[PDB]
């Protein structure tokens, strides 16, 4: 009786037991438990996956079937599906029981739990949808719920303007996703998962490039690749568990997921896989520089997100997408931890600044969340002890994976990315914990109160980052791939260069110790170099000038209203119909109106003389050359 629909519909009740709310509190202690009981039965299903059947949930309905298509509400739960669902159930559950004591006071505080729970519902139907249609249903619901959700507040800039440039930049992926879906339905019939995997044996083995780069535009838009990536930084400024779902497991992660359920056709188009490589190769370095500079700790973790998925984009570009799947699981468990850690330390400080320059003591002045985010930071730095050694340093091995040539460059690219990934965590950790006390507000231990059982969210995910690395050892394993005999990462696993394979972590330890050595000697932040270093840190602090999109949007809204200026030229095709006729009226009434009250005989008599003369003369003009048609056109010059 514990069927797969209880893995979905229970989360749906999270909306329906909150639409008929009438309960100012208590929606926590009901709805969060209602997500917990989904999470544990999904774990029971994952434990049940020794046998590896496929529960199809197909006749929910039939959506439409007219000619050569049959979209059904199809729900198969695959091995590729379960990794992401055991991510999002765990992350969502821990956000739920993280969100209880935090964000307790609001003018409306039930809408928050309700929206993120029903968001988890549309995220899970995004993942478990067995076609491309329900894939779109979830993949579009999550963004337009994020419009309502990251704008949970009703403030000026940091949410309400921000939700537009979040969702509209999602919408740039939405439109070309619909375009690629149209090319799917021209080429393929069923528009599912099942038939499409069988149809990689094409008519003539054609291009298929406009199948997948159209969806890769969405894989730029979702999963925040460099063509448009400012919206993570701009949708950062919602409340912090929203940003937790935004960067760890749900929002930014579907952009890899629609690549993964389309892993069949990546294996038959290398020409898109090459740009899949190099775009993420650009994003790793871009994220590295911006999260070096900009001093908002939520921005540092938010750019650490796109850094850690840039080499996942490289990994799917290197066909070893099992490693990409495992890394998405591990990264989800990472920024599950570090976000609610940062939300805890924001909550404890009275000022609640999102800076780093005002913190000083995450020493024994507040030591617990330091230990938790220390675990999570060593987790980010690919340290050898835990799943950071597993979630990375196998992707960077795959960069060296030499079934591809002209591939040696991205090893160094990801190497620089990993060094910068280490200096992220060191940059925040010294400035929070080992630095001198920065802001003298909350002086006499006014931040000493540590939050409210928020240990219990953080402790389970800390276990799932420390010793869940032993678990899920996938790198000779089945795990439902497609794998078209190109690379298979076998040569990448066996005997790369020891001066390369071992250097990637020794440099990590060296750079971590060096950024820790900025305490005893302070010149990295110093020296105030105007002509070189100041402008460099400025131009890398403004999101690598992603505000050049303000030379792309607000430099064309003016063109969008020059379109309005043109649309008034269309009234200039109608205004004169009420104006040039209103000159024609005075022109027609001014002729033969010399006296016009007296003497009106003479006007009319000379007029009918002109009538018979002009008409007989124009009969003479007619029957000699009929082409001469100016004598009427000059008469239209009067009226």
């Amino acid at each position: 009786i514990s069927l797969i629909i209880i893995l979905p519909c229970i989360s749906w009740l999270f909306p329906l037991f909150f639409g008929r709310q009438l309960g100012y509190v208590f929606v926590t202690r009901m709805t969060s438990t209602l997500i917990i009981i989904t999470t544990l039965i999904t774990y029971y299903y994952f434990y049940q996956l020794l046998g590896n059947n496929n529960p199809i949930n197909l006749e929910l309905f039939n959506y439409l079937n007219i000619d050569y298509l049959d979209i059904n509400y199809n729900f198969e739960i695959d091995a590729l599906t379960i990794t992401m669902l055991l991510a999002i159930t765990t992350i969502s559950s821990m956000v739920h029981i993280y969100s209880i004591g935090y964000m307790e006071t609001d003018p409306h505080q039930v809408r928050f739990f309700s929206l993120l729970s029903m968001f988890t519902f549309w995220m899970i139907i995004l993942v478990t949808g067995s076609n491309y249609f329900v894939l779109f249903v979830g993949w579009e619901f999550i963004g337009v719920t994020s419009y309502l959700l990251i704008s949970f507040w009703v403030t000026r800039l940091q949410a309400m303007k921000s939700a537009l440039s979040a969702v509209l930049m999602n919408r740039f992926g939405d439109a070309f996703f619909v375009l690629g879906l149209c090319v799917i339905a021209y080429v393929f019939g069923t528009l599912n998962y099942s038939t499409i995997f069988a149809t990689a044996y094409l008519i003539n083995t054609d291009l298929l490039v406009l199948i997948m780069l159209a969806l890769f535009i969405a894989a730029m838009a979702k999963s925040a690749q460099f063509g448009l990536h400012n919206w993570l930084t701009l949708a950062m400024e919602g409340p912090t568990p929203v940003s937790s779902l935004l960067h760890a497991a749900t929002l930014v992660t579907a952009g890899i997921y629609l690549l993964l359920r389309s892993a069949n056709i990546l294996e038959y188009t290398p020409t898109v896989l090459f740009i899949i490589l190099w775009i993420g190769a650009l994003t790793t370095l871009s994220a590295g520089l911006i999260a070096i500079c900009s001093n908002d700790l939520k921005r540092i973790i938010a750019l650490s997100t796109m850094s850690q998925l840039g080499m996942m984009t490289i990994a799917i570009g290197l066909s070893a997408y099992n490693l990409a799947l495992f890394h998405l699981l591990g990264h989800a468990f990472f920024k599950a931890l570090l976000f609610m850690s940062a939300g805890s330390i924001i909550h404890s400080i009275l000022n609640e600044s999102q800076d780093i320059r005002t913190y000083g003591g995450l020493l024994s002045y507040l030591p617990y969340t330091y230990i938790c985010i220390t675990i999570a930071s060593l987790s980010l730095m690919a340290m050898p002890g835990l799943t950071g050694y597993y979630t990375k340093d196998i992707i960077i091995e795959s960069t060296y994976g030499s079934y591809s040539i002209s591939n040696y460059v991205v090893y160094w690219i990801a190497y620089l990315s990993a060094v910068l990934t280490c200096v992220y965590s060191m940059k925040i950790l010294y400035l929070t914990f080992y630095s001198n006390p920065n802001n003298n507000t909350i002086t006499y231990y006014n931040a000493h109160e540590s939050n409210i059982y928020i240990t219990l969210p953080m402790f389970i995910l800390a276990i799932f980052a420390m010793f869940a690395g032993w678990i899920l050892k996938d790198i000779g394993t089945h795990i439902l791939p497609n794998n078209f005999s190109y690379f298979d990462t076998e040569f990448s696993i066996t005997q790369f260069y020891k001066l390369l394979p071992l250097i990637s972590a020794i440099l990590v330890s060296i750079l971590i110790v060096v950024l820790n050595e900025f305490f005893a000697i302070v010149f990295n932040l110093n020296n105030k170099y105007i002509n070189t270093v100041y402008s460099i840190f400025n131009q890398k602090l403004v999101s690598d000038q992603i505000l050049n999109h303000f030379i792309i949007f607000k430099g064309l809204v003016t063109s969008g209203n020059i379109a309005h200026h043109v649309d008034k030229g269309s009234l200039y095709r109608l205004g004169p119909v009420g104006i040039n006729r209103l000159l024609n009226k005075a022109s027609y009434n001014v002729i033969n109106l010399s006296s016009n009250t007296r003497s009106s005989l003479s006007m009319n008599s000379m007029l009918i003389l002109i009538t018979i003369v002009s008409l007989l003369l124009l009969v003479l003009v007619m029957n000699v050359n009929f082409i001469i048609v100016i004598p009427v056109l000059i008469s239209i010059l009067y009226i």
Binding site: Y63, D67, W139, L164, A175, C182, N561, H564, D567
Partner: protein, 475 residues
């Protein structure tokens, strides 16, 4: 028998004791809903014009029994879906305008009920004569409804109707005259059969085409529409019936199959470019415009522009997506216009946006009926519309891939409307209004909620009353 409703006309004559003449005018349309619903229990299969009535009575004055049927032949067919679009909307206008009658007179309801029956007869028409005699008989009632009861400069507003949608109309008169003088017959339900050769099959296409260009607007004139929408008189049919009056996509589907079996010479080099740059330009016209009704009027132009490239696709997916936009937009957009008119104009009397912003902080559930409804206009992952413009983009991409490859930016420009609109509608200051009143009027809640459920309940696409490619394809 015969006089069973003339006795009810005596009931209507004595019913003016209670001097409203409104509740009877609502119960009449309420009975008309069932009188169409029982009629929906007949059109089973076999794809011919099921019912029949002549109603111009060649050998009578009101009957249908002859052998020389020189009459109007008003009847039903697979049009009936639009009729099932119609009769659940006709009371829903009046109930949406039940309070703000603006007591100059009661006959406003009689005008709205009148055009509500007239476009039902438009959908019940069959012949070119019969379709034309109903296709503009709305317009005097439209003109009286704009001229009195409007808010803005009615002398500017009402004349644009009888300029433009009479202009394209009596251009359509040319094509109707020419095909009625070639065929000497006009039974469009019975004549998908003509040896009409091209180059005189072409100019009749032009004469029909610029007509429907005027009705469902394109970039040669589309300013026809939004100033009718600007001075929009009296919430119930300020827009809503003139929003269903641009379901002259029934003209482009009912006509233009049965004697335009050869019109591919002007299918792709004319309709697709004139559609595509509307969906670019006219949808791009909603950035700086400040009237609250004009920005959804242009959205209506955009949705119909999507739908007609679906129409001209020669694929059954395109036709069916067009028809389901014809019901879907006619669900979502009358709800939005009832929002801005019935409970957001009447609270404030002002339709600009610049000092209008700030909601959700004293009208809570108004914003919840705003954002999902604006998403249902956005494109919406579920069926408020989606499968409409989805299948329309499918057919448009099938017939020509490049213009569809630009036309998929419709979803971006659909977002550009409402998601500029909504966040600078619900931004929490509201410092120029005085915290007006209750949001849902408890019957306005019903009128918005019926259209909301009617949008959302098209999830399982019900195509039962449409053998879709019955007569619109080519080899």
């Amino acid at each position: 028998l015969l006089s069973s409703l003339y006795l009810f006309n005596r009931i209507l004559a004595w019913q003016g004791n209670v001097k409203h003449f409104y509740l009877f005018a609502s119960n009449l349309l309420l009975l008309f809903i069932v009188v169409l619903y029982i009629n929906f229990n007949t059109f089973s299969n076999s794809f011919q014009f099921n019912f029949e009535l002549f109603n111009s009575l060649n050998p009578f004055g009101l009957s249908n029994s002859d052998i020389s049927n020189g009459l109007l032949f008003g009847i039903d067919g697979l049009s009936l879906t639009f009729i099932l679009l119609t009769v659940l909307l006709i009371p829903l206008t009046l109930l949406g305008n039940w309070y703000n009658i603006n007591f100059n007179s009661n006959l406003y309801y009689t005008l709205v009920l009148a055009i509500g029956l007239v476009i039902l007869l438009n959908f019940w028409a069959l012949d070119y004569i019969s379709f034309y005699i109903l296709f503009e008989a709305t317009l005097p009632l439209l003109f009286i409804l704009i001229h009195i009861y409007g808010s803005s400069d009615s002398e500017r507003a009402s004349f644009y109707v009888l300029m433009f949608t009479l202009s394209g109309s009596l251009f359509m008169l040319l094509s109707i005259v020419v095909i009625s003088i070639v065929l000497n017959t006009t039974n469009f339900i019975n004549h998908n059969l003509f040896v009409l050769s091209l180059d005189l099959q072409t100019i009749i296409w032009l004469g029909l085409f610029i007509a429907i260009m005027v009705k469902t607007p394109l970039f040669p004139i589309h300013v026809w529409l939004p100033v009718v929408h600007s001075e929009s008189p009296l919430a119930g049919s300020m827009i809503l019936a003139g929003l269903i009056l641009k379901l002259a996509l029934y003209a482009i589907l009912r006509l233009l199959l049965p004697l335009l079996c050869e019109a591919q010479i002007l299918y792709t080099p004319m309709i697709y470019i004139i559609s595509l740059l509307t969906i670019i330009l006219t949808s791009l016209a909603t950035l700086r415009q400040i009237d609250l009704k004009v920005i959804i009027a242009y959205s209506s132009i955009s949705h119909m522009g999507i739908a007609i490239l679906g129409v001209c696709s020669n694929t059954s997916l395109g036709i069916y997506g067009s028809i389901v936009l014809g019901v879907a937009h006619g669900f979502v957009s009358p709800a939005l216009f009832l929002i801005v008119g019935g409970i957001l104009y009447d609270r404030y009397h002002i339709r600009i946006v610049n000092y209008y912003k700030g909601l959700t902080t004293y009208m809570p559930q108004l914003a919840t009926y705003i954002i999902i409804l604006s998403f249902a206009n956005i494109g919406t992952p579920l069926t408020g519309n989606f499968t409409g413009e989805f299948l329309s983009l499918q057919g448009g991409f099938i017939r020509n891939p490049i213009i569809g490859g630009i036309s998929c930016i419709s979803v971006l420009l659909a977002a550009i409307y409402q998601l500029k609109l909504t966040n600078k509608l619900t931004g929490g200051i509201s410092s120029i209004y005085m915290h007006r009143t209750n949001d849902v009027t408890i019957r306005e809640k019903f009128i918005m909620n019926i259209l909301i459920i009617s949008t959302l309940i098209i999830g399982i696409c019900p195509q039962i009353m449409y053998n879709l490619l019955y007569w619109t394809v080519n080899n």
